[PDB]
C-alpha cells in the first residue's frame, strides 16, 4: 500500500466481468483490494494428463526435427507452461478441443484453451487460479440457447434440469481473461447479433446479462448507470456499513 | 495530464514540479529552455528555422537511411555497381591513395528528406567526419543531384600500408571490427 | 464509442461499455486523491 505508483491500482480493461469496477476500498488500498463479480468463478485446478494424452492422439509431434520452421507447423501447443509439441493444423485442433469441452470427456468446463493466430501459439491453461465467467455461445449469428432450454430451466425443480445441464448441452461456456482476449462478445443478443449495419458478423459469445459485471455490494445500487462512478464506490463502502 | 496544449511541449506542473523546485533536484523531469530571438529572425520564420536547426542536436544516425560494410578489394573494382561512376571521378585524380587504400568500405546512405529538413550538406557532413576523425577516415561524397546520397568511408591509408605505423606488423581490432566500431561511434556521437 | 466516449447523459443512463469506461475514469480520480495526500503532507512538513 505504501507505493504511490498509480499503475497497479487503476481499473484494468481485463477486469471486465470478473472483478467489480465499483467496489474497492478507499485510502491506501484503492484498486489494490478487489471483489469478485457476481457470476465470476475461480478455477479449482485439474490434472493436465488427459489433455496431453488427447493432444498426443490427435498429432502434436514432440521431439521433432526443427519442424517449427518459420512456424510452418502452425501453432505450438502449450499446456500449463511446458511446450508439449506442435501441430500442422491449428484450427481443426481448436474445434476438436471445443467439441470435447462440450462433451466433457477430457476437458472440464474450467480448462481454458487460447490460440494466438498471429504468433501461432495455443496455450491450454488449467492451473487452479484462473478467474473465469460464464458466457453464452453464439453459432453463426444465433445463440445456442433456445426456448427448450429456457422452458426446462423454468420448470427447474421437479424437472431435474439445472445450470450444469445447461453447461453440458454446450449452451454456455466458461471463459477466462486469456480467452476473453480471443472472443468476440455481444452485450445483448437482440441488439447485436441481429442483422443491421454490420459492425461484427463473427460474434462468438454473448453476455448473459451486463449487470453481472458488478459485485455483491454494487449490485444493491439501484440505477447505478445514472450515478457518477465514485459515488458507486462510496455506496459499496457504505453498504458494507449499514445496519440490518 | 489535462494541461492545456498551448505548445507541443510537455511541462511538469503541480505537486511533482513543486517537489523538483523545493528539492533543487539536479535532474528535472522535463528540463526546458525558452529562447527568444534578437533580430529579424524573430519576425521571419525562415531565419527562426535556421536558428532552430543551429540549436537542435543532430547525430549522423538521424540523417542516415542505411549503413552497409562491403569488402572492396580495389577502388577501381567498385563492387557496388552504383559507385562505379563517382568513384572513377574521384579516382580520375586520386587523392590520399598514395599511401594505400582500405580494403573495407563503409558505404553509408543518407535519407534526402532528413538532410533537407536539417538543411545539412554533403560537404558539411564529410568535412565533419573527416576532420574530426582525422586523415584516417577518407570519405567520398556523392553529388546532391544523384538519386542516392552516398558516403564511402575507408580506414587509414597509411595504417593500411603499415609503413607509417612501423613497430610490429600485428592487426589491431582487425579491420572490419574496427570499422563497425567506427560506424557505431558515427551513428551516436557525430554531433553534426 | 470504442475508446471511451460516453454520449449518453447521466439522466439517460450509461450503456454497459460506457459504464465500465466511466468506472475507469472515476478510479483514476480516486487514486489521484489517495496518492496526493501523502506527498503533499511530506512537502508541507519539510517547508515548515
Amino acid at each position: 500500500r505504501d507505493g504511490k505508483l498509480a499503475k497497479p491500482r487503476q481499473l484494468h480493461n481485463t477486469l471486465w466481468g470478473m472483478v467489480c469496477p465499483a467496489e474497492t476500498p478507499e485510502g491506501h488500498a484503492v484498486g489494490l483490494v478487489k471483489n469478485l463479480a457476481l457470476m465470476a468463478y475461480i478455477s479449482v485446478g485439474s490434472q493436465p494428463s488427459p489433455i496431453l494424452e488427447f493432444l498426443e492422439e490427435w498429432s502434436m509431434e514432440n521431439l521433432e526435427e526443427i519442424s517449427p520452421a518459420a512456424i510452418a507447423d502452425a501453432t505450438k501447443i502449450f499446456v500449463n507452461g511446458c511446450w508439449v509439441g506442435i501441430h500442422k493444423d491449428p484450427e481443426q485442433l481448436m474445434n476438436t478441443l471445443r467439441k470435447l469441452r462440450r462433451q466433457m470427456d477430457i476437458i472440464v468446463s474450467e480448462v481454458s484453451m487460447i490460440r494466438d493466430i498471429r504468433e501461432r501459439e495455443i496455450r491450454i491453461y488449467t492451473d487452479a487460479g484462473r478467474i473465469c465467467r460464464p458466457l453464452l455461445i453464439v453459432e453463426k449469428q444465433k445463440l445456442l440457447l433456445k426456448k427448450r432450454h429456457i422452458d426446462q430451466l423454468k420448470e427447474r425443480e421437479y424437472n431435474n434440469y439445472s445450470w450444469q445441464d445447461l453447461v453440458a448441452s454446450g449452451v454456455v461456456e466458461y471463459i477466462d481473461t486469456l480467452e476473453e482476449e480471443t472472443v468476440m462478445l455481444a452485450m445483448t443478443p437482440d441488439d447485436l447479433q441481429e442483422k443491421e449495419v454490420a459492425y461484427c458478423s463473427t460474434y462468438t459469445h454473448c453476455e448473459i446479462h451486463p449487470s453481472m459485471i458488478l459485485g455483491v455490494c454494487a449490485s444493491i445500487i439501484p440505477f447505478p448507470d445514472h450515478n457518477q462512478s465514485p459515488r458507486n464506490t462510496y455506496q459499496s463502502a457504505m453498504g458494507k456499513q449499514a445496519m440490518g | 495530464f489535462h494541461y492545456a496544449g498551448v505548445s507541443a511541449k510537455n511541462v511538469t506542473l503541480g505537486v511533482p514540479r513543486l517537489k523538483e523546485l523545493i528539492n533543487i533536484s539536479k535532474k528535472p523531469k522535463t528540463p526546458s529552455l525558452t529562447v527568444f530571438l534578437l533580430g529579424q529572425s524573430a519576425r521571419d520564420a525562415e531565419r527562426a528555422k535556421d536558428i532552430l536547426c543551429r540549436l537542435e542536436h543532430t547525430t549522423l544516425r538521424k540523417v542516415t537511411a542505411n549503413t552497409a560494410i562491403y569488402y572492396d578489394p580495389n577502388p577501381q573494382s567498385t563492387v557496388v555497381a552504383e559507385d562505379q561512376e563517382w568513384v572513377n571521378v574521384y579516382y580520375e585524380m586520386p587523392d590520399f591513395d598514395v599511401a594505400r587504400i582500405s580494403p573495407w568500405l563503409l558505404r553509408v546512405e543518407l535519407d534526402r528528406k532528413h538532410m533537407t529538413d536539417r538543411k545539412l550538406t554533403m560537404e558539411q557532413i564529410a568535412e565533419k567526419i573527416n576532420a574530426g576523425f582525422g586523415d584516417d577516415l577518407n570519405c567520398i561524397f556523392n553529388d546532391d543531384n544523384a538519386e542516392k546520397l552516398v558516403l564511402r568511408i575507408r580506414i587509414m591509408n597509411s595504417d593500411e600500408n603499415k609503413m607509417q605505423e612501423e613497430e610490429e606488423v600485428v592487426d589491431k581490432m582487425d579491420d572490419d571490427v574496427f570499422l563497425r566500431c567506427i560506424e557505431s561511434n558515427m551513428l551516436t556521437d557525430m554531433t553534426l | 464509442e470504442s475508446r471511451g466516449f460516453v454520449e449518453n447523459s447521466y439522466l439517460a443512463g450509461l450503456t454497459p461499455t460506457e459504464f465500465f469506461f466511466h468506472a475507469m475514469g472515476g478510479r483514476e480520480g480516486l487514486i489521484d486523491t489517495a496518492v496526493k495526500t501523502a506527498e503533499t503532507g511530506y512537502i508541507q512538513r519539510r517547508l515548515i
Binding site: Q228, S229 | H2, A4 | G25, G26, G29, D32
Partner: peptide, 8 residues
C-alpha cells in the same frame, strides 16, 4: 470523466 483538458 469529462475530457482531455478537464478531469478524468
Amino acid at each position: 470523466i469529462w475530457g482531455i483538458g478537464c478531469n478524468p
